[PDB]
């Protein structure tokens, strides 16, 4: 048999093939590759059996856990260090040092988000900012409220059609502008951070580690700072004390009925021992070629953690809390 993996892009498919070929050479548990174009296509594919697994950000574990998919998280990615490992991360608001505006004075500013309906880039900041959005609930789409709040933004995935302001700072070329893919350079964590660094925006909504990952030199990282919820600004290393929310890690999702939770688990368990962190000069399960990022799994992940059975998206996600 084979656990069929779901890729949301060619480079992700490319890496999937290499993964398959290395599991073979090593005589390990088999993996196969399906190529889709988005988290949704993969969510359906799995639901309808053309695939078994895909790693998802919390806002998508949310959407999958719903009918008609009823998908369930199976393994969580692990962050941190081997020494201090964790299966959650911090949604922060990163800004340029020098400014004076606080979390509560963002009206009319320009923003950079990881992507529409993602945790750190959308769901968390938007729920936080809500008391200032003056949003006249349904039927009125939140994006409509958001577009009138920030002057211009980069929200990979937003409907440029009805919300051009949300795609305004985006850097993609042509039809790719504001695409929820890597064809849009300001997509995801690293791209949301680049949008801040390029000075397209004033605030980037990302996770804690991005600045450390994207900036090796400690000097440069001193140019940045974070917006805390008590309306203060703190240095970058202070995320523990200054964050908008604490969130469960991205997780591998599978069917709730005949998902193959066990095959998936053994494949991940062995791939991690064989090609995990610092294990093989030939293949890195957590590592992307230059130009790409977070292909299949997060690049800085150190491993996986199995999620106990029958545990639904609901309880998985219920782990998190909005800055209290």
Known binding positions? 57, 89, 114, 118, 120-121, 189, 250
Examine residue 190 and tell whether it contacts Fe ion (CB under 5 A).
no
Nearest-5° angle of CA 289, CA 11, CA 295? 65
Which of the 8 DSSP states describes residue 190? H
Distance of CA 5 to the CA centre of its chain: 18
**Which CB atom, from 119 or from 210, has the smaller least distance to Fe ion?**
119
Q: Which stretch binds Fe ion (CB under 5 A): 19-27, 47-55, 111-119, 217-225?
A: 111-119
Strands 3-7 and 31-35, how do they pair?
parallel
Query: Which value, to the nearest 10 degrees, does the dihedral of the CA atoms of residues 190, 193, 199, 203 take?
Result: 150
Nearest distance from residue 119's CB to Fe ion, in Å? 4
CA distance 304 to 268: 7
Q: Which stretch binds Fe ion (CB under 5 A): 16-24, 76-84, 118-126, 274-282?
A: 118-126
**Which CB atom, from 119 or from 182, has the smaller least distance to Fe ion?**
119
Count the site residues for Fe ion by CB under 5 A.
3
Q: How far is CA 232 from CA 44, 99, 103, 121, in A?
A: 43, 12, 8, 20
Nearest distance from residue 250's CB to Fe ion, in Å? 6
CA distance 174 to 248: 35
Residue with the CB atom nearest Fe ion in the bound state: 57
Q: In this structure, what are the phi and psi dihedrals at residue 267, rounded to the nearest 5 degrees?
A: -60, -50
Element (H, E) at 322: strand 321-322
Examine residue 119 and tell whether it contacts Fe ion (CB under 5 A).
yes
Strands 88-96 and 203-207, how do they pair?
antiparallel
Q: Show the 3-state SS of 203-262.
A: EEEEECCHHHHHCCCCCHHHHEEEECCCCCEECHHHCCCCCCEEEECCEEEECCCCCCHH
**Which CB atom, from 114 or from 272, has the smaller least distance to Fe ion?**
114
Tell which phi-psi region holds residue 177, choosing left (phi > 0), alpha (psi between -120 and 50) or beta: beta
Nearest distance from residue 301's CB to Fe ion, in Å? 12
Examine residue 153 and tell whether it contacts Fe ion (CB under 5 A).
no
Nearest distance from residue 300's CB to Fe ion, in Å? 12
Rg over alpha carbons for the chain, rounded to the nearest Å, is 19
**Which CB atom, from 263 or from 317, has the smaller least distance to Fe ion?**
317
Which residues are annotated binding-site positions for hydrogencarbonate?
Answer: 114, 118, 120-121
**Which CB atom, from 57 or from 202, has the smaller least distance to Fe ion?**
57
**Which CB atom, from 124 or from 271, has the smaller least distance to Fe ion?**
124
Give me the active site residues, please: 70, 256
User: For Fe ion, what does the binding mask look like between residues 57 and 96, x meaning CB under 5 A?
Assistant: x---------------------------------------
Nearest distance from residue 232's CB to Fe ion, in Å? 24
Query: In the chain, what's the furthest Cα-to-Cα distance?
Result: 58
Q: How far is CA 148 from CA 142, 156, 196, 225, 227, in A?
A: 10, 17, 20, 26, 21
Nearest distance from residue 120's CB to Fe ion, in Å? 5
User: For Fe ion, what does the binding mask look like between residues 22 and 61, x meaning CB under 5 A?
Assistant: -----------------------------------x----
Interface residues with Fe ion (CB under 5 A) are 57, 119-120
């Amino acid at each position: 048999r084979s656990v069929q993996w779901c890729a949301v892009s060619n480079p992700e498919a490319t890496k999937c093939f290499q993964w398959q070929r290395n599991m073979r050479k090593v005589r390990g548990p088999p993996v196969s590759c399906i190529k889709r174009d988005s988290p949704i296509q993969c969510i359906q594919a799995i639901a309808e059996n053309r695939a078994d697994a895909v790693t998802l950000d919390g806002g998508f574990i949310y959407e999958a856990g719903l009918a008609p998919y009823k998908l369930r998280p199976v393994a969580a990615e692990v962050y941190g260090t081997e020494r201090q490992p964790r299966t959650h991360y911090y949604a922060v608001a990163v800004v340029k040092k020098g400014g004076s505006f606080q979390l509560n004075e963002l009206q009319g500013l320009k923003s950079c988000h990881t992507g529409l309906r993602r945790t750190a880039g959308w769901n968390v900041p938007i729920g936080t900012l809500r008391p200032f959005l003056n949003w006249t609930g349904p039927p009125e789409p939140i994006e409509a409220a958001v577009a009138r709040f920030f002057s211009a933004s980069c929200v990979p995935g937003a409907d440029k059609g009805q919300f051009p302001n949300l795609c305004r700072l985006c850097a993609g070329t042509g039809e790719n502008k504001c695409a929820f893919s890597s064809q849009e350079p300001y997509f995801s964590y690293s791209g949301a951070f680049k949008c801040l660094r390029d000075g397209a925006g004033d605030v980037a909504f990302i996770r804690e580690s991005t600045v450390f990952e994207d900036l090796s030199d400690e000097a440069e990282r001193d140019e940045y700072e974070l917006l805390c919820p008590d309306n203060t600004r703190k240095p970058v290393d202070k995320f523990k004390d200054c964050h908008l929310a604490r969130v469960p890690s991205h997780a591998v999702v599978a069917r709730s009925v005949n998902g193959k939770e066990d095959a998936i688990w053994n494949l991940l368990r062995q791939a991690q021992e064989k090609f995990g962190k610092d294990k093989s000069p030939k293949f890195q399960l957590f590592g992307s070629p230059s130009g790409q990022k977070d292909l299949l799994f997060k690049d800085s992940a150190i491993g996986f953690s199995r999620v106990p059975p029958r545990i639904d998206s609901g309880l998985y996600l219920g782990s998190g809390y909005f800055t209290a």
